[PDB]
Assembly symmetry: D2
């Protein structure tokens, strides 16, 4: 598995959060999301009927996988990691199992993950996938209904508004009929997958976690799995901000990654213009890299499928700083 050597020297990856949440852009009926605009459905308890209707308005005329991959490559990013399905349960690929997806439900009627997979394959960039294996707000038995004594970036971890009957919920039904089928689809279509990125599990049993692990192993032997799946079921450690060294979980292969966003939201938010400066981005990358940690830097695409102007500017200027610094 050359992927271990490659990942230890990759240093830099682009992450992409994009979905129906992007159309609301951090705002609902005159009121603000939390820092996390992608959590807006939970934040305002938007019924599935209304939220899902955003699919009818999803027509990102300027989306261009080739150009997004070109930007990542120009910044020295060696891989890319996209939301296949976030907490809202809306798939960004053509899902045989669930018609609640970007291909079937939207006038755009295209496979975002497929286009990025191809663009990456052509450019020489590795391709990785993010799936919300626990939380799913579209599913009556979506996870997080046992976790609501801890506050969130929305209201509840689960969809507790369309599905109020907590005691009647049963994650097994959602796992068996949606999660595992969808994981099999994304790990089967879309070619070689370098990296698999799972959410923080809360509802999943040890059994259900082992299943996902074995499934990925079988379908994508050379895929590196992040630590957020389950203990002993990963190839690299995802470090939270509170876990970076100054200037735990064992790492058997010596592989590490911290994910960040350029402003304070993962999803696009009109109101969030708090973009980290080129120098902040470059310095943070250099500090992680010096500690043998990969920087996975999020872009939140806008409703027309564009990298925000200020995100693009700050990525390119951080690269100019880095290249200047690395001569001498």
């Amino acid at each position: 598995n050359d992927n271990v050597a490659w990942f230890k020297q990759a240093k830099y990856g682009m992450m992409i959060h994009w979905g129906l949440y992007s159309l609301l852009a951090g705002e609902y009926r005159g009121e603000s999301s939390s820092a996390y605009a992608e959590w807006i459905q939970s934040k305002f308890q938007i019924p599935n009927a209304e939220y899902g209707n955003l699919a009818t308005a999803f027509n990102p005329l300027y989306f261009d996988a080739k150009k997004i991959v070109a930007l990542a490559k120009q910044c020295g990013m060696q891989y890319l990691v996209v939301t296949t399905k976030h907490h809202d349960g809306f798939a960004m690929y053509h899902s045989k199992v669930d018609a609640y997806n970007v291909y079937d439900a939207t006038p755009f009627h295209r496979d975002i993950i497929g286009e990025l997979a191809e663009a990456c394959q052509k450019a020489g960039l590795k391709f990785g996938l993010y799936y919300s294996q626990d939380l799913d707000w579209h599913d009556p038995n979506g996870g997080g209904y046992k976790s609501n004594d801890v506050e969130t970036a929305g209201t509840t971890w689960d969809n507790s508004w369309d599905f109020p009957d907590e005691d009647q919920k049963n994650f097994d039904l959602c796992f068996d009929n949606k999660i595992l089928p969808q994981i099999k689809e994304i790990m089967s279509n879309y070619g070689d997958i370098a990296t698999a990125w799972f959410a923080v599990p809360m509802t999943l049993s040890e059994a259900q976690s082992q299943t996902i692990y074995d499934t990925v192993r079988e379908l994508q032997p050379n895929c590196l799995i992040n630590s957020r799946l389950g203990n002993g079921k990963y190839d690299f450690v995802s470090l939270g901000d509170n876990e970076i060294p100054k200037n735990f979980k064992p790492s058997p292969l010596g592989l590490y990654e911290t994910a960040g966003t350029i402003n304070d939201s993962w999803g696009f938010s009109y109101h969030d213009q708090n973009w980290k400066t080129p120098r902040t981005l470059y310095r943070y990358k250099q500090h992680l890299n010096d500690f043998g940690i990969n920087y996975l830097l999020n872009v939140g695409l806008d409703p027309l499928g564009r990298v925000p102007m200020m995100a693009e500017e700050n990525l390119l200027a951080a690269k100019a700083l880095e290249d200047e610094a690395n001569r001498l």
Copy 2:
């Protein structure tokens, strides 16, 4: 009789909304000027590509009733909407031109009609803005004689899809689009209190008289702004730099940030106190404040615009009890 009402109106909402709103001040990694609604001229976007934005126009949250409720809660007594801006895209159902919000967009609804009705019901007067000179969708759109002066885009006219300047002839555009479209908006959509025209550059004296007489005939009580032509108006539109003939009616238009059209990158919202003080200064001088909102791609008043309007009203009411 609208003369008495207009002298005491004090406060109006203006609305800029169109295909420009979907691009939201940004095109291929670059910024519009302060005026996001000028973005097509700014980047010389071909009509084929720009017009295609119509296919993506589906503002799920647009709600005329709620927009008029906000205006009325702020003490605004009237509302003035873009029926067609410089891009030449009509925001009503135009018999004359299929390049409109009803025929060209999946939303497939008449924005002006809905606002007209909401206004009528709420007791708010209704006014219309039409670009009678500039039209970037029309081969003979105006501004092809005016390009020795800089703009909020590139050229005043569409000089990219229509490069042959000397072969242009505004009469064809005036006769076949401008005057027909003015007749439609002044015929459908009920009583019109206010008619708001752009800065004329190409229009002849004749063409200006025609528009004046047309509005007079179709909408006898409609007050016409000074930007049409000298001696062809009922009230003066003052620029900020002009606050000191009027046969005694006056209006200054402003926007809450620095753009008329919606712009993601422009978060330079004037504070409640700025909005209230400016209103009080204009009002004290017998001048109406026409305050622009630029609706977002889902048809929403931006959160910060709504907050600042409501807080300015709270300041004004507090002040007016002292």
Copy 3:
């Protein structure tokens, strides 16, 4: 009677002001954390250099009367000032330590004395904040046992001028500076309604009891916040994360931007509506809102803080007539 008064006070102004204010969130081309007042720890600025800021402290526009006028106009019934923060610089005339605003600065005036008088005259209650544990100017300042937890600076203690951790001894600092200074502020400056202590880390249970008894003796009617020590307080200081004590007295402290001390780079001012709604939510739960202002180097309430406080009050009054 202070118990009854505090349960119905609802609203207080807090003030963070010191040498930190002159650096204003910036040191040698780099940013403080969100907490600009922690800047000395953040950059490990030696006492010799940091203390030299005293030579530049000349806030020509400081005006206790006007600051109290603003607080009173916003319905604030009390005021709470930093007498000495973590940097160990007293903002009153301290007999015990020459490292104070009177002796060390050209301004050569007693900030706490002026505010005490302005409050007394306006009918506003007066409260004092003292850092009883951390003191970065003192060789035996607290926090040298707490550095396995990260801070808004580097270390909790001054570990740069005073590196030898194992040789430090908080008793020397407590006996010779903390308790003397607490006695001064609780003796001069008249009746004290409220005593606001920092989160203790180094203090013994004994040292906490001493402060409690000292305040009780010198200022019998002073209400003491919960941050002193368990069973040694009259009201609970709640963090936001602690909203769903025997006298039923509660207070949550907040700042208008994200810093307690003034920071030129921090323009993230909470909107009037955010401020008003948060106040209303705390008040509905029987919790007092203590809202921080961070005075600028000339002793001014920042323009945007003043605007947002006044607009929040206008929203509140409008709402409370509905």
Copy 4:
């Protein structure tokens, strides 16, 4: 005069606005200056007695000419131009003729212009001077009392509050007793002066302009004089924004300069965080340079004598962009 050849290839200069205005930082009694914070005295008609008292609070502990010149040089700036005296009439050098200066009136009790002159001399950077030869709000006969049919960045062009009797004013008294003496001082002390930068004249006679021209010529033979002095009395043209070429006043030596600021104020302003991005700064510089026009980019020092953090970041990132570009 090698200065003509040198100026045609200089491309890039730092400008500095700094004075009592800097302490008020765009704010007075709860209210905002215009975009131009340095005009704040006119904006609020602050009496000379109160405004001048700011001198007592002027103690910029962090001012460091050596470091400011280091920054300019790191950004490829080949010269530096400082306010010796702006419209407020407060000199930033030790003036024999007027005690209303940074040396005599302030506890800092040092010569800003002298320190920068020396730092520049040592670093190999040319040194230029800005003097307000017309407007002077401290002087009873300061200019602009004939010009108040045009609006300003303050209230009136002249100090019309301390000196209300417009018809009794006489600029000759101010010119003879302050302007020309002060110009002689700055052109005599402070070594070789590469560039002389005058304000837009409104009150000055043709005679008074000729005098300044001849004075500079005699005292500083190789000093290049900007066009804002008087027609036929200049070596290079100062172009206003509205005069830059696309996709007048003749220039006999073919010398051109446009001055700009990084935010929207020349003087420091707390409230103005509208910093032009690295890419804006670099692109504008490249466009001017391609047209043989020098870019004179203003920094407005803060009350402690610091280059604002975001101004320093944007200058350095613009340089990184420029160097990256110039290797492509």
